[PDB]
Symmetry: D2
Subunit: 205 residues, 4 copies
């Protein structure tokens, strides 16, 4: 990608945002990987939308890319696991444990064991290190504080967190310059003409 093309994506993001296409904004953030939307991230975390949270992240980093990004995924999964335990759905908890969390065992063998053993407890708050886990809403919120730090420290992000500030609807302004450029080639030009389309250059007569 040129830096032109890259910048154009940003204009487009602005536009989509202003046109209130909320889902389309975040697919583009993700697919381009140019801007990570914290506010959106927090929102989805709080809503416990784990499939989308992982999906959004996946446009910025893979699980093993570096240590920050590995802890980020680990934390998210862990919470997924615990919520399953709370609703006493141990069938799900197990599914998570093997499918999502097993990848982390290589890096710490003993912690994986210790987390596995939570399955056998009447309440995982019987573990003193997890004795603090209060309700879902709260755990999510406390975890979010941690994720924000991890992300801001992550070198794969650090340059993606701040939307370059620019005049509203820059794209629309640029578009206009092109319609003005089209008519200024018209001769003999009417003073104020009608636009046939954006699709093909305007003309007068």
């Amino acid at each position: 990608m040129s830096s032109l093309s890259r910048e154009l994506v940003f204009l487009i993001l602005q536009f989509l945002d202003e046109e209130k296409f909320k889902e389309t904004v975040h697919k583009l953030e993700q697919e381009s990987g140019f801007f990570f939307n914290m506010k959106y991230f927090e929102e989805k975390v709080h809503a416990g939308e784990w499939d989308e949270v992982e999906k959004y992240l996946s446009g910025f980093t893979k699980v093993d890319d570096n240590r920050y990004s590995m802890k980020i995924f680990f934390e998210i999964r862990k919470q997924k696991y615990l919520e399953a335990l709370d609703r006493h759905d141990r069938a799900k908890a197990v599914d998570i444990l093997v499918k999502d969390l097993k990848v982390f065992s290589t890096f710490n063998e003993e912690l994986y064991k210790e987390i596995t053993q939570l399955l056998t407890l009447e309440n995982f708050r019987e573990n003193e290190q997890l004795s603090k886990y209060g309700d879902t809403k709260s755990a999510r919120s406390i975890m979010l504080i941690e994720l924000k730090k991890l992300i801001e420290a992550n070198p794969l992000f650090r340059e993606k967190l701040v939307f370059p500030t620019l005049k509203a609807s820059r794209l629309r302004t640029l578009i206009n310059q092109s319609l003005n450029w089209q008519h200024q080639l018209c001769k003999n030009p009417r003073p104020n003409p009608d636009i046939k389309t954006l699709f093909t250059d305007h003309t007068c007569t």
Copy 2:
């Protein structure tokens, strides 16, 4: 929305498509509801991605909007139900039947009953009207033929199926006209300058 704004969305779609952002294209198709992508629809149907198929459709129509759109949803769900029956997951099949299909009972009470009764069969091919259902891949394909017709007949679609043909990267061309417009205001203009950004108007000196 102005017709300007509407047309601009199309340029954007073209661009996103050319930049190979495939997911972002289809979110925008859906959220704008301006263009229904048949090819994409077929693809997702074949892949049995039912959650996304319904989601994509939902940008163009609700289930009860008209008779075509109601049969479209009905057909899709029905297949969802049958696939559940085939993998002998009758727990899912039941979930579908009450959650997704019940809405259709008002409109036909007896058919809902008749579909409900398929649960009790060793194989639903014991019903002669379903005796034809061959493998998944085939049923999907035959159903697709039916959906295509339903959609092309649906008045909510009929004006959304054909992408207005236009020169490649029209958006990029327009952008350029604006950079040319910017420099042509430069005086004394250098002959060929460097672009500082798309974000704020270019200048020379």
Copy 3:
């Protein structure tokens, strides 16, 4: 079986009952099929022990033996089904419906359909014929009244419901007569000897 042998079973039942071997009594009732214990039946019905209720019955009748015995099984299963629906375990309810209840469809096709359709309801009390079903304990109790009638009318039972009245521990009394018979063959007999065993005839000297 001789009527001797048959009568001996009854003595044995008395004995087991007096020795408080409760499970062994009812296996013998079932396996011999000579006596149906109403009190036990009521108890198990109330406790919702369906697997044992069907098992106990199976020593007296099969499902299709006659019309009374067919309604008895049907009623029991139906309640099994409804209880599954109440705990909103529709996966179980379906399992019951195909495995246990399907056998009854031959005899009434339409009722099977009507019962099948209860799966789709938010609450099966939406059916006015089932609008009466109050709590489990109550439904069981009302159903029990019905079962008692069905059983007392069932010709396969009618001659099995009343335990022939007899002196306590008749078996023990008979045993004694045999030990008295053994010693009365002893000569020269001591007046009051010790029993070596029941296993082989007693002797003196």
Copy 4:
């Protein structure tokens, strides 16, 4: 219980066995706890009937009564757990692990952990100590060899494994002695009379 009464149970067992009441024999073995039927035990083990195996045992010992009986239960459960893992029903495996096996953790904390960790494996034969587990039929059989030893060594059993040998239908013989005793009191006695019943003493005239 008198030793009379105890011996009478044995006669009864013989009788029930000869009358082919197979279920009633084993309920009585269990409820009396006087005789443990190895052959029956092997049979049920091979058939993987775990609920009945534990039930039968429960008439002879509780889980914590002594060390042999504790290993016996542990072994049985462990196999239950592994079979669940093989059919890849990890929901069941977990159910077993917490409900049945947790009791054993007190006595060995680390082994419980090590067994818990088998849940996360693609195949538990990845553990070299379980690398030997071949098919179900075989594992059951090898385990049976082990159980037989454990039982024969268990002091709660050691005196319960051998059925005292006695003439066929001893009970029937004893019964007869009582009918002979009844008629020998008849005077004037007919030479060969008819038995009115076993229920009340016979008489002549």
